[PDB]
């Protein structure tokens, strides 16, 4: 399966 | 336009959405990065998914 992408930038 | 899963995906955090290959998904938010908020039209559940595991459907 494809590599998972990094998690999105968390919003503050 | 709906999307279909190309692979199964098992949630890695509570607010992810797990899904199966072939599952039809509505993309609800796709402006926050590589992870999209999706609603399964098959299971009714909603959560984040890796955008590279799904593709546009009919």
Keywords:
heterodimer, A: 12 residues, little secondary structure, rod-shaped, B: 58 residues, mainly beta, SH3 type barrels, five-stranded antiparallel beta sheet, 5 strands, 40% strand, globular, Proto-oncogene tyrosine-protein kinase Src (chain B)
Q: How would you describe the overall organization of this protein?
A:
The complex is a heterodimer of chains A (12) and B (58). Chain A is low in regular secondary structure and 12 residues long. Helix content of chain A is 0%, strand content 0%. Chain A has no helix or strand. Chain B has 58 residues and is mainly β. Chain B has a single domain (1-58), classed as SH3 Domains (SH3 type barrels). Helices cover 0% and strands 40% of the residues of chain B. Chain B is built from no helices and 5 strands. Chain B has strands at 3-5, 24-29, 35-40, 46-50, 54-56. A 5-stranded antiparallel β-sheet of chain B has the order 4-3-2-1-5, with no helix packed on it. The chains are: A little secondary structure (12), B mainly beta (58).
């Amino acid at each position: 399966a494809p590599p998972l992408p990094p998690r999105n930038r968390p919003r503050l | 336009m709906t999307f279909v899963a190309l692979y199964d995906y098992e949630s890695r955090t509570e607010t992810d959405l797990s899904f199966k290959k072939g599952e039809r998904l509505q993309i609800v938010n796709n402006t926050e990065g590589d992870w999209w908020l999706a609603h399964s039209l098959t299971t009714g559940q909603t959560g984040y998914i890796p955008s590279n595991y799904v593709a546009p459907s009919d």
